[model samples]
Target: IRWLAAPTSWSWVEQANAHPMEVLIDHAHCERKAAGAAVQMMFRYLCEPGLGEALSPLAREELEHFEQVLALIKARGRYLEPLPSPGYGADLARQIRKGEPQRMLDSFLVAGLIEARSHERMALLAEHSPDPQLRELYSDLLASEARHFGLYWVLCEQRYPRELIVERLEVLALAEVKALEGALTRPEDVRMHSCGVDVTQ
Candidate 1:
């Protein structure tokens, strides 16, 4: 069953393809954030052995991807520059329910949504990029991101009833759609979470 609500539009993909260097730089940051997010989850959910086990390898792989993107940047004679946070994630965070288990569950659901969207974006880039190397790289990472998406749900299922899980997921899923819609109202920079029109233009 499809977990995500919808595919990213072709307009966004075209804009991303138009700025390959910027996209790669933003992608590197995304990988770094993904790694850190996994570690953060592991620390926060230490009592959950399955969560820790799943996140450890995920963190490592994300770090590896980070390094790989950095290498690609360097190889192309580009330098990594500091980027301001896009604040797209705050939308999801705002939707988190109050208190312990609920808060944690919402967090996991948000992460899953992010990963699912990342998987979709990566697949788009893989198929549409004019650069063969970029296409190949994204294609290779697709399975890993997809796996991460599934693992989040697995953790949720281990703790909550399927009925509860599904109910909560639907709520967050709608929120995610709203978040994406809000994102589209702003001018975009070439970040991993960019939406709306290309700001650089």
Candidate 2:
């Protein structure tokens, strides 16, 4: 649950650091998406016990994060500019099962992995961003981001047995790796999730 199948490429980190505000713009969108995704889960899984309640706080926190990032972007004289998908989300979506029960399982695991990767990239930026505003903002979001992935993992474990959850998570984890690898970074579009293994250590 902690370690991703692979690490963030160094190229991605340097790209993030070099264009920290671009990362900020992207990050604001990410937070908004995180909030919406939580709400989506709630509507999609009303029958599940305690899940709606569990996700409410998460949704709130995500929105709070969204607001925080939005505030920073504006204060720093930047606004969110939509970036191309880089295909990571679609790649994960392909891994999701369409069948019931199993479909739900895949859904939670997928979210868990996404949060894990988000946590990873945010941490990298927190450590390396030259901009003090971005560095502090990334650092502040770390705890909640870590909690979010854990929330997804806990939801998965609660409904399914640990054995099935682990095996299925590993399966999705490989796909996550492939999706990230496929998101090869171009100089103009250095994304948080893009491949950067070719960059320096």
Candidate 3:
């Protein structure tokens, strides 16, 4: 919500406008990543009917957005080459404590944090994008990201033991902050795209 108060970081927008092609490539990657997370949630928490229903729609929408970004890239004669990703999601994942039910709850909270962060970053990018169309597209995504965050939060509450949910969210939030403030090298995966690994199959 704080991120919605303004556009993306000034430096990020300037750099993105300088290289719209790369930005679009990242956008496409983000959509795919989101879909992957949704699918993971659906399968991991098989009994959570609410998660399945909520995430299904989100996955579909993200795939559609991914296609849209691909179209824009194609129109601009930009090939979707894989790029080296800085350890954004990887770092966050590293911090995720491993276990059974706790792991499931943590993963859900972490995924929600990712969505909230994405929404904020996109708004920032939209505000600074030179292309009006791109800016508008990013703006359109803000609402969905907010909804995604809420959905994840609700699930965490419903699925986990009542007392532990808030404590877990705080733990996840702290981890998220550390990841954000840590050393993110240039040409970093600011878009939260791939999980710092090769995408080529």
Candidate 4:
């Protein structure tokens, strides 16, 4: 099994530079999702108590970050128009092994990878976007995401033995790479941050 490569590739950065607003939208969406996921994980932990300590705080932080993103969007005169769900997330979520202990554990590690990827993408966007505001927003978000990644990894380590976490992470990472490479298309925005291709096609 192979560990998921860290998001450091030139191609990954290129992808981010190509889409700033889209990346922002996705970042907001991801933080919202993380908050929700943390809620669910906390509930499960209350009953079974796997990794609640780590997950609960993370959920709070992510929610706070989501709020920050919303404020930025509002300042930019943008609203969260209902964008179609990015298939990349569902692609990975679909791979989780159903069951008690493993399911929660899988969630933590996968969430970590998602955060890591988002941070990389946002950093890339920050570097490339022409708009100073967008660039600054992404840069700020990159820091939060890095912290989220650390929280997720810490929770995973605390809940599962290192060997098991590593093995499962390898599996999750493989699936994540596949999802990223699959290039699942999504609808493109027509306005300012146009991605130049109909990803949904």
Q: Candidate 1 regions off by >4 Å?
A: 182-188, 196-201
| Residues 19-134 of candidate 1: C-alpha lDDT, one tens digit per residue | 78877888898888888988988887787768778889988998999999899999989978886556667888899888888988898898898888888888989999999999
lDDT score at residue 115, model 3, on the 0-100 scale: 81
Which prediction has more favorable lDDT, 1 or 4? Answer: 1
Worst 10 residues of 1 by lDDT: 180-189
TM-score versus the correct structure, for each prediction: 0.90, 0.92, 0.80, 0.80
- Clash pairs (backbone) in predicted model 3: 7-124, 8-124
* Candidate 2 lDDT trough over 10 residues, lowest sum: 192-201
How far out, in Å, is residue 111 in model 1?
0.7
Candidate 3 local lDDT, 165-189, one digit each (tens): 7777766666665554433245444
C-alpha lDDT score of every prediction, in listed order: 0.80, 0.80, 0.69, 0.68
Cα RMSD for candidates in order: 3.9, 2.4, 6.2, 5.0
Highest TM-score model number = 2
For candidate 1, the per-residue lDDT at 38 reads: 84
What lDDT tens digits, residue by residue, belong to model 2 across residues 71-125? 8888989777887656777888889989888988998888889889989888888
> Ranking by lDDT, best first?
1, 2, 3, 4
Which tens-of-lDDT digit does each residue in 85-119 have in candidate 4? 55567887897778978887888888787777666
For TM-score, candidate 2 versus 3, the one ahead is 2
Q: How far in Å is the alpha carbon of 41 misplaced in model 4?
A: 0.8
